[PDB]
Each structure stands twice: as C-alpha cells, then as structure tokens.
Structure 1
Amino acid sequence: LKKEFELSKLQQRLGREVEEKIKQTHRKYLLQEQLKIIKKELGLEKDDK
C-alpha cells in the first residue's frame, strides 16, 4: 500500500506540476478562446458602427 500509494502520489504530483506548467499559458489565450467562441457563435456581420 505504501509503495503503490507512493507511485500514485509521485504521479499525482508530477501531473499537478505538468498541469501547473500548462496553466502557465497566459489568460490572454483563454480570453482569445472565448473570443473565437464569440466569432463562431452567430453571424459575424455586425454592421453597426
């Protein structure tokens, strides 16, 4: 149980560290994703101002 849990623990920590290093991708990228979601959600042609 100790060794198997230590394997799960080292993997969970390694995955948390890789996941944190992937979260390092800036928030501009996230807002850009939502921006593309806005561009492909409805007709782009606003033609207001």
Structure 2
Amino acid sequence: RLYKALSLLKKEFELSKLQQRLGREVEEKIKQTHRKYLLQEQLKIIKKELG
C-alpha cells in the first residue's frame, strides 16, 4: 500500500512537473517579447495619466 502510494506520488509529481514546465516554456516564449515593449507600455501609461 505504501509503494502504490509512492508510485502515485511519482505520477503526480511528473504531472506537476510537466505542467509547471509547460507553463515555464510557454512563459519563456512569452518573455521573448522585448522589454522595450514594456517600456512602450510605460509610455502609454504616462499618457493615460497625462490628459
């Protein structure tokens, strides 16, 4: 009963690892947008609160 509980822990960590990694990869592919775009967003913010 222990070993089935451990193998189930293994399966759950492999799933959490694959989901965390799927999110980390997709997140990295969204970080490819340049930080200059963030600075452009700052620019927009400035004008938003500058009317």
TM-score range, shorter chain: 0.7 to 0.9
Pairwise CA distance, 1:17: 0.6
- Indicate the residue corresponding to 1:47 in structure 2: none
Aligned partner of 2:33 in structure 1 is 25
Runs of 4+ in structure 1 deviating by more than 3 angstroms, as ranges, are none
Number of matched residues? 43
TM-score scaled by length of structure 1: 0.80
1:5 CA displacement: 0.9
User: 2:6 aligns to what?
Assistant: none
Residue ranges of structure 2 left out of the alignment (5+ in a row)? 1-8
Match of 1:38 in 2: 46
> Which structure carries more helix by proportion?
2
Matches within 5 A, 1:4-15: 4-15=12-23
- Structure 1, unmatched stretches of 5+, are 44-49
- Superposition deviation, residue 34 in structure 1: 0.4
